[PDB]
Design a protein around this ligand. Structure first.
Ligand SMILES: Cc1cc2nc3c(=O)[nH]c(=O)nc-3n(C[C@H](O)[C@@H](O)[C@@H](O)COP(=O)(O)OP(=O)(O)OC[C@H]3O[C@@H](n4cnc5c(N)ncnc54)[C@H](O)[C@@H]3O)c2cc1C
Ligand code: HEC
Ligand code: HEC
Ligand code: HEC
Ligand code: HEC
Length: 570
């Protein structure tokens, strides 16, 4: 029994097969050579993908964006797990396979060993350091690179794009070209007012102004980098159709993550995967001088830089931490990728950074317990209805998420069903992937759908003809639903069991419109420390509206990148 990958290969050629040297060892955390050797012998992703069965789901052709290494799944000296295992359950036949498991390691554990190495010299310099490879960081790698900084960006997972790459529903922006093309009359103020009402007026009004005001330049920016943001639909809590997404209702996440990845990489961004930043370095009256990296394979190393951008994401995946704030959520499932655990929040805190709103944890109301994935709010915005086990509607389906989850939780079985038709289906191309994931019930009639779910045919049917009249009259007499887009009358009929999940953390680092990280001692910025995206707080108040986090990450990430780079010129 030879079982792990490198031992299997051991039997054939040794150590230089994968390693540069015949003694073994990696030379860089990206594992450049080892993957290259894999590709020399087995072909690369296109070629692997090229040969799979023309039916369903292959592990070499997925929706992960950016450069996805072989070794990020085919492990050499330990069991291998497909990365997909972190979110789906396709039960693949992984040669040399183990099961998925991730232990949370405190950024602070191994304090002695990091100190020897901060002492053990400063190994390398650069202008701007950017932490994390989601939109905030990539948006910022571009913008800093455009300004002349030399940038180094670190990502702790084996693959890039963090939660951003999974987004679907859209990016909000007011007063855009796409809206002009569709004749949607919207106003930057309205977007402001929508953001403030929905975050229960505790949002920092200065950050919501910039987020609203810069939104349309920030659609334009993406377009000029190659993005396609021409599809606009509704999301809950907004009064105007403002969620931007690729032609036809395709999710934005993979699309935006990959245009931004391309552009960071086409400027000379030095991106390092499997590299986790475990500390930001210190000095006099606390000026940021660089950071301490912990490479998975090459260990601890200090990189000196003038400015440091924190684009590290939220902590909703770490239920422990989520639960200390809102014990309600102990044990709920999350919609996040695995690395959304809190890491850069600690890092920043260990650096004196100020924090705000950390106890306001959003729960997304329509998570698919069978699929193990989130169903976009855009299904509801596009016209779906939500219905309980008696076949009756219990809420306004484009309401704020704190409220939508609460209602679903007070129904029998803590869960309800998304009910939409064939027009809703063809108006939102993301629906097509829940369909490819085998989790959508299809009945040829409303009553045939009811059998499939297990709901009273008479009552579902009753609630669907009831809801169509509200759609013709323009007034939902049951719940208060302000947008009633589509009659829900073209057969075949679809249904999906949804239930709430932990999703996004509104709190975080305190910043100002320049992406500057403010101090807990003074209220004044820490010189040279900047940040953007969900690791920061203030933008969303106590309930993020759907659409504002991709808007936040682009707009703010662009600001931190430009801002940190000017710092570097001085
Ligand atoms: C499934 C899903 C769908 C959503 N869809 C939408 C949508 O349609 N519209 C919308 O507005 N919002 C949506 N959101 C919310 C939106 O995705 C933002 O929450 C997310 O994009 C945040 O971007 P970010 O840059 O802040 O971080 P992320 O995308 O999390 O990027 C994170 C990088 O930091 C790396 N990292 C963290 N700590 C360290 C460390 N110490 N060292 C090194 N690297 C580190 C992490 O691994 C991570 O990859 C959705 C969220 C989810 C999960
Ligand atoms: C390994 C490379 C993966 C394979 C194969 C697939 N995935 Fe994913 N996945 C995830 C989510 C949250 C969704 C819904 C997409 C969204 O709405 O953002 C999906 C979707 C799929 C689909 C159907 C959709 C499509 O056809 O594009 C397939 C066939 C699929 N996934 C296979 C979540 C995750 C995830 C968590 C962070 C990971 C690592 C992967 N998926 C990876 C794989
Ligand atoms: C290709 C199949 C390999 C062969 C043959 C050998 N190694 Fe390797 N090694 C490979 C990978 C993909 C990786 C990255 C981590 C992983 O286990 O997937 C590695 C890593 C190492 C390391 C670093 C381990 C760590 O610091 O965690 C060492 C010291 C190492 N490999 C040594 C080594 C020796 C001595 C080998 C010959 C007997 C050898 N490797 C063969 C892939 C492959
Ligand atoms: C050339 C020197 C190789 C390098 C470098 C790597 N692999 Fe390889 N691999 C090679 C051969 C000749 C074989 C045997 C083919 C056969 O006759 O079956 C393999 C086998 C594999 C397998 C199959 C495991 C199984 O189905 O049990 C896998 C998944 C595999 N190799 C992957 C892989 C990866 C990810 C590599 C980079 C680290 C890699 N191999 C290096 C030839 C060579
Ligand atoms: C995780 C998302 C993967 C990445 C990235 C790569 N591979 Fe893969 N590989 C993975 C799985 C789950 C499987 C098994 C499929 C099954 O269920 O049997 C495989 C299989 C292989 C094989 C076997 C045979 C073949 O299809 O030719 C080989 C040779 C292989 N993988 C190599 C390989 C290389 C070179 C990759 C880099 C481009 C690579 N894989 C990526 C999971 C994943």
């Amino acid at each position: 029994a030879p079982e792990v990958l490198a031992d299997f290969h051991g039997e054939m050629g040794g150590c230089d097969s994968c390693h540069v040297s015949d003694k073994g060892g990696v030379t860089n955390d990206n594992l450049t050579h080892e993957n290259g050797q894999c590709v020399s012998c087995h072909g690369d992703l296109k070629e692997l993908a090229a040969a799979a069965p023309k039916d369903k789901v292959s592990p070499h052709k997925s929706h992960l964006i950016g450069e996805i290494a072989c070794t990020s799944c085919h492990k050499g000296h330990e069991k291998s797990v497909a990365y997909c295992d972190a979110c789906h359950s396709f039960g693949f036949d992984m040669p040399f396979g183990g099961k998925w498991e991730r232990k949370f390691v405190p950024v602070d554990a191994d304090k002695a060993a990091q100190d020897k190495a901060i002492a053990a010299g400063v190994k390398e310099t650069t202008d701007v350091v950017i932490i994390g490879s989601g939109g905030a960081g990539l948006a910022a790698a571009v913008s800093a690179r455009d300004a002349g900084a030399k940038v180094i960006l670190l990502e702790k997972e084996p693959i890039p794009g963090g939660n951003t790459k999974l987004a679907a529903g859209g990016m909000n922006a007011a007063e855009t070209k796409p809206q002009a093309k569709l004749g949607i009359e919207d106003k930057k103020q309205i977007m402001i007012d929508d953001t403030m009402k929905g975050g229960r007026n505790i949002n920092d009004p200065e950050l919501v102004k910039v987020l609203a005001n810069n939104s349309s330049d920030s659609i334009d920016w993406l377009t000029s980098m190659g993005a396609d943001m021409t599809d606009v639909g509704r999301m809950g809590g907004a009064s105007v159709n403002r969620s931007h997404r690729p032609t036809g209702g395709a999710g934005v996440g993979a699309h935006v993550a990959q245009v931004l990845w391309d552009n960071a990489v086409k400027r000379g961004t030095d991106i390092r995967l499997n590299s986790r930043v475990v500390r930001i370095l210190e000095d006099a009256s606390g000026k940021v001088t660089g950071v301490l990296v912990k490479g998975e394979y090459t260990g601890y190393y200090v990189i000196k830089a003038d400015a440091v951008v924190i684009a590290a994401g939220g902590f909703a995946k770490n239920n422990e931490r989520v639960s200390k704030y809102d014990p309600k959520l102990k044990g709920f499932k999350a919609t996040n990728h695995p690395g959304a655990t809190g890491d850069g929040l600690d890092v920043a805190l260990q650096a004196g950074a100020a924090t705000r709103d950390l106890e306001y944890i959003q729960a997304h109301p329509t998570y698919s317990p069978a699929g193990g994935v989130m169903i976009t709010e855009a299904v509801r915005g596009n016209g779906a209805i939500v219905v309980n086990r008696e076949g009756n509607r219990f809420m306004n389906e484009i309401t704020t998420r704190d409220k939508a989850s609460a209602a679903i939780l007070q129904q029998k079985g803590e869960s309800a069903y998304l009910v939409f038709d064939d027009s809703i289906r063809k108006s939102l191309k993301a629906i097509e992937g829940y369909v490819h994931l085998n989790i959508v019930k299809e009945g040829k009639t409303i009553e045939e759908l009811a059998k499939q779910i297990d709901v009273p045919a008479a009552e579902l049917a009753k609630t669907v003809t009831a809801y169509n009249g509200f759609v013709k009259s323009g007034k939902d007499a049951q719940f208060e639903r302000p947008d009633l887009p589509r009659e829900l009358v073209v057969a075949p009929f679809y249904a999906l069991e949804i239930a709430p999940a932990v999703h996004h953390t509104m709190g975080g680092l305190v910043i100002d419109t320049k992406a500057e990280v403010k101090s807990e001692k003074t209220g004044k910025p820490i010189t040279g420390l900047y940040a953007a995206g969900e690791v920061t707080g203030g933008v969303h108040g106590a309930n993020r509206l759907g659409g504002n986090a991709i808007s936040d990450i682009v707009t703010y990430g662009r600001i931190a990148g430009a801002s940190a780079a000017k710092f570097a010129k001085d």
